[PDB]
Every structure is written in structure tokens, then in C-alpha cells.
């Protein structure tokens, strides 16, 4: 845990321009950023990118996005989100991170946070 | 389309308690509700359930939930969500925001149930 997403607020809905706030801590420094996007997660990634650029960190390209719930999980089901990344470019640098949470967007933020640390660590 | 979801606002994140607002039109009546949940969509359905309960409508149980983006993945990718219900059928939603894609499928399920 060298990079932590202290908090984030994600907005979306019908009649709403999606947006997200982020507050991440890295090396005794806290970065707060906001951005709109075509979707909540997209907005979250756009805000994240302004931070990583500042830090000189390159974010891998999102190659695959998978979401699943256990059978008969229902509305409050735990969501498993698997995101596949690629640093370049073709297969040799492809990897996946995963997140599990009752909110599907948080699950994605968690998988993204894991990715960030794997790249930094 | 018999039932229309005029608007809805969903809010989640780390450090926030998931909540959602919904505004729907049915049989010449406007219904507006709010509620928290374990997740945005969960909050949305909790708010929807208050409405359906008032209408005497029982919502089908959510059995499976599928989310996919087209090949050549990108953060701003369109989301295609397929939800499976059982009292067993399926509804679909397509939208750049994945929570909205689910809501669209939920709206479809609703209209299909209120026939
Ligand atoms: C990977 C696609 C993402 C999840 C979608 N565009 C959203 O912001 O909801
Ligand atoms: C079907 C499970 C839903 C998507 C999840 N509990 C959420 O509200 O994010
Ligand atoms: Zn907001
Ligand atoms: Zn709010």
C-alpha cells in the first residue's frame, strides 16, 4: 500500500453529466481532483489521470472489463470486477486486477487502485 | 412504454453512503423517491421498491447481472448490461455510464411486467 485512494465521489444518472472526485495519498502528499466523463468510472479515470500525469506515472490501457455476481445475488449483491490491463501494444505485458464490493463502481476503483500499486511496487 | 423513468441521480464512492433518487411517471402520476443502499444500483432499486410497493407491484428478483463493453476496451466505452430476473427472463441496457445501463434494463423489465 504505497498509493491509497482516501476517498472518491462518483455521480451519474438520467439527466446527469457524470462526474467524480478523487483524493489519493502518495508519498506524504495528498492529491484532490475532479472531472466529468461519459460515465462514472470514466469520470473517475479522467480525474485519476490528471494526478498520475503530475506524478509522472503512466496508466496502462484498459483492455477488458468484466463484472459478475454470484447466482441469485440480488440487488445488494457483491460485485466482482475484473479489469485487464496492458502497458504497451500486444500480449506480453497484459495483466488483470480485481475488486469485490457491494457497489459496482467502488469495485472498479479498487481494481484500479490495485493496478496502481502493482505498477508502482 | 407504459412506465417511464423521467430522471434518477445516483451517488457512490469511497467515504460516501450510496444513495439514489428516482422520478418516474406511471398512469398519470409522478413518483419521486430517495434511498440509500449497499451500492448505487442497490440504492436505486430500494427507492424504486418504495414506489412499486405503493402501486402494489412486486419487483422480480434479480438472479444474474452481466456487464460488457465492446472489444477494444476504453475507459469511456459504451456499456451493455443484461439482467436476468425471476418471479425467468432477460432485459438489456446500453449506455456509457454502467449504472444508467442497468437502470435502462430495469425500466425495460418494468414495462414488460406491467403489460
Ligand atoms: C469500461 C467502461 C466504463 C465502466 C463506462 N464507460 C462507465 O464510465 O461506466
Ligand atoms: C446486482 C448488484 C449491484 C450491481 C450492486 N450491488 C451495486 O449496487 O452496485
Ligand atoms: Zn457530485
Ligand atoms: Zn447526492
From Swiss-Prot, chain A:
Outcome following mutation: residue 42 to A: 1.8-fold decrease in Km for acetyl-CoA and 5-fold decrease in kcat
Induction of expression: Expression is repressed by isoleucine but not by leucine.
Range of residues in the leader sequence: none
Phenotype upon changing residue 102 to A: 1.5-fold decrease in Km for acetyl-CoA and 2.6-fold decrease in kcat
Known function: Catalyzes the condensation of pyruvate and acetyl-coenzyme A to form (R)-citramalate. Shows strict substrate specificity for pyruvate. Cannot use alpha-ketoisovalerate, alpha-ketobutyrate, alpha-ketoisocaproate, alpha-ketoglutarate or glyoxylate.
Domain notes: Contains a catalytic N-terminal domain and a C-terminal regulatory domain, linked together by a flexible region. The catalytic domain consists of a TIM barrel flanked by an extended C-terminal region. The active site is located at the center of the TIM barrel near the C-terminal ends of the beta-strands and is composed of conserved residues of the beta-strands of one subunit and the C-terminal region of the other.
Assembly, per entry: Homodimer.
Membership in a protein family: Belongs to the alpha-IPM synthase/homocitrate synthase family.
Name the record gives this protein: (R)-citramalate synthase CimA
Species classification: Bacteria, Pseudomonadati, Spirochaetota, Spirochaetia, Leptospirales
Swiss-Prot record, chain B:
Result when mutating residue 98 to A: 1.6-fold decrease in Km for acetyl-CoA and 2.8-fold decrease in kcat
Presence of keyword Amino-acid biosynthesis: yes
One GO-annotated biological process of the protein: isoleucine biosynthetic process
Effect of residue 96 to A: 1.5-fold decrease in Km for acetyl-CoA and 2.6-fold decrease in kcat
Keyword vocabulary terms for this entry: Amino-acid biosynthesis, Branched-chain amino acid biosynthesis, Isoleucine biosynthesis, Lyase, Manganese, Metal-binding, Pyruvate, Transferase
GO MF term (any one): 2-isopropylmalate synthase activity
Keyword Transmembrane: no
Comment on protein domains: Contains a catalytic N-terminal domain and a C-terminal regulatory domain, linked together by a flexible region. The catalytic domain consists of a TIM barrel flanked by an extended C-terminal region. The active site is located at the center of the TIM barrel near the C-terminal ends of the beta-strands and is composed of conserved residues of the beta-strands of one subunit and the C-terminal region of the other.
Family statement drawn from the similarity comment of this UniProt entry: Belongs to the alpha-IPM synthase/homocitrate synthase family.
Record-given protein name: (R)-citramalate synthase CimA
Organism the protein comes from: Leptospira interrogans serogroup Icterohaemorrhagiae serovar Lai (strain 56601)
This protein's encoding gene: cimA
Amino acid at each position: 500500500k504505497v498509493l491509497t485512494i482516501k476517498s472518491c465521489n462518483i455521480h451519474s444518472g438520467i439527466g446527469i453529466r457524470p462526474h467524480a472526485q478523487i483524493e489519493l495519498e502518495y508519498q506524504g502528499k495528498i492529491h484532490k481532483e475532479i472531472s466529468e466523463g461519459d460515465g462514472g468510472y470514466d469520470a473517475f479515470m479522467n480525474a485519476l489521470t490528471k494526478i498520475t500525469n503530475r506524478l509522472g506515472i503512466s496508466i496502462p490501457k484498459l483492455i477488458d472489463y468484466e463484472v459478475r455476481i454470484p447466482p441469485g445475488g440480488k440487488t445488494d449483491a457483491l460485485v466482482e470486477t475484473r479489469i485487464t490491463w496492458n502497458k504497451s501494444l500486444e500480449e506480453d505485458q497484459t495483466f488483470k486486477t480485481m475488486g469485490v464490493h457491494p457497489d459496482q463502481t467502488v469495485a472498479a476503483v479498487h481494481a484500479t487502485e490495485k493496478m496502481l500499486n502493482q505498477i508502482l511496487q
